[PDB]
């Protein structure tokens, strides 16, 4: 079993081969060295891409021996997990984290149709073609993509999972509250957060806890401000980009404007807003296409390239 | 013999027959520069409204206090207006020498920065040791060249314009005063009057710093004001601020904007500016950011930023601008 470098949140267990368990999107594993290799899998949940040359697809291998190398998770798993059991490594000083919802995940980004069954949706979701991994790869930065489709700051798509939010999900290694994530070597100089579409895309239902739109605004702003504050207090070198669409009549963007003002008013000044525009939304269910993802990546790339000493 | 000169700030240049070229000004922090080989210099003034400082080479500044209509007897030479004139103007009539002197290269500054604002941007009472100031003490202690704007420009060797006037807001001025006016309505003009629109094809600042909103929001609405609810004031402030920045951008495509405000008035000011930045970006004008400043002592006249506060705000701006690759294009 070769020494490994890991990107993304994984639970490491050492009973037998060391096992790596992951459920957040866009996880990867890299190795370096001979003239043979075998990847050991226990994953009937994900589609993967192996990069030795052009990428090769590995679809739901299950528990099998598969005979520089980069394995990248492509698909989204909100309710299940997958296991990888193993094979001079990359020493990337730059680190960037993307936090978000469907957009950040790459939900349906490679679908040529906006009409997708559940199966089509799973298969055409490619997190590695989403803006986050593209942006990271432009700077040769290690990346974590901590995102989950449908989730908001305080409110989720159409008031679904009212007991949850991206923020309640965020502290955990997997899609369950069994293990909290800590890695003292994970200290991204840049954090890009894209949340609010799900909080505001739909009207409040009568059985939700916000009884007026203003109450929702107030709760969203308060919690987003607190969130960036905790991230900062644990990582003094982080600089924040709060990224949102120009949709929902500007409601999302305005609440984020308030978040940014309030954070700066409180003394946390290393925070900026990006409002993105002009997407075709031609992926599944009117989500960003692969084209849209490249566009968004180009936006972030140009933005970060103008910031002196952003990585130091 | 008048020397070739360089002008900073908005100036009405007139060339009346059989008289010196006349430079008329009213906006704060105006300056005139010249350079020559020789040993004599006279400044011709027609200004009993301003205090100036004169900077000869590497020497300390010398104060010139309301010189009036006089010839002032005194290389690189920089003359700076210090004081604010809201209801009057002053004239400078040039740098005069002996005909044997050689004109030298004037400053060719590629960098240009503009500060738009209110009393904070002017430097209202900034050098006063006391927060109690009569009108005369307020006038004397106001030094625009020590406010954060000129200090920021000098760290980058940029030319600057300080288009600020005390008490004014985006839509609403201090305690609803001058309800027929705002900073925005004064802004188009070369001087303190509607008589001439300012146009300067060579003035295209890469950076524009706007600090406005303290006067819109620092006080409660009176009964006789046109906004009947606080929400009305917010809405009108946001729309006009957005409108203003768009207009500035439409005439100067290169300009990058910094909207700068205090953490005071319970955060009301910062919040409205957050909405402005968001609405600008949402409309496709992305080259805009917010700065919220904190931790001033406000020891100048009537609880305004001190000269110390001014240096602190300058350092804030300098550091911000230093981190921006290619901001000077």
Numbering used by the authors:
A (entry chain A): 27 to 41, 44 to 61, 63 to 81, 84 to 98, 108 to 127, 137 to 361
B (entry chain B): 26 to 99, 107 to 361
Quoted from the paper:
CtCE2 along with CjCE2B does not possess a side-chain residue equivalent to the Asp of a classical Ser-His-Asp triad. Instead, these enzymes display a catalytic dyad with stabilisation of the histidine provided by main-chain carbonyl groups. Instead of the more typical Ser-His-Asp, the “triad” geometry is completed through the Nɛ1 of His-791 making a hydrogen bond with the backbone carbonyl of Glu-788, in the case of CtCE2, whilst the equivalent interaction in CjCE2B is with the main-chain carbonyl of Cys-333. Based on their catalytic efficiencies, CtCE2 and CjCE2B exhibit a significant preference for acetylated glucomannan over xylan, whereas CjCE2A and CjCE2C do not distinguish between the two polysaccharides.
CE2 enzymes are acetyl esterases (that are generally not appended to other catalytic modules), which are reported to be active on synthetic aryl-esters and acetylated xylan. Here we report the biochemical properties and crystal structure of several CE2 members, both single-module CE2 enzymes and CtCE2, a component of CtCel5C-CE2. All three 3D structures reveal a bi-domain enzyme in which an N-terminal β-sheet “jelly roll” domain (around 130 residues) is linked to a C-terminal domain of approximately 220 residues.
